[PDB]
Amino acid sequence: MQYKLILNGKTLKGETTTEAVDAATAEKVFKQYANDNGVDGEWCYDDATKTFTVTE
Numbered sequence: 673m674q675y676k677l678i679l680n681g682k683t684l685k686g687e688t689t690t691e692a693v694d695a696a697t698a699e700k701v702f703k704q705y706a707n708d709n710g711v712d713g714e715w716c717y718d719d720a721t722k723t724f725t726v727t728e
């Protein structure tokens with residue numbers, strides 16, 4: 673499935689996507705994406721829109 677990440681950081685704001693078999697796996701990918709891009713924040717996930725947010 674295609675999942676979306678919305679980053680709401682102090683400096684980084686944007687959207688990206690990944691393909692994963694379940695939300696747990698997507699979450700791993702996006703937590704790494706956020707960290708790799710210097711973001712350390714508060715997470716939310718709506719399976720009804722396959723969308724994660726990370727907000728600082």
Ligand SMILES: *SCC1=CC(C)(C)N(O)C1(C)C
Nearest residue numbers: 715716717718721723724725
């Ligand atoms: S908890 C904040 C949040 C993120 C997102 C998945 C986009 N949502 O629908 C709400 C607004 C609940």
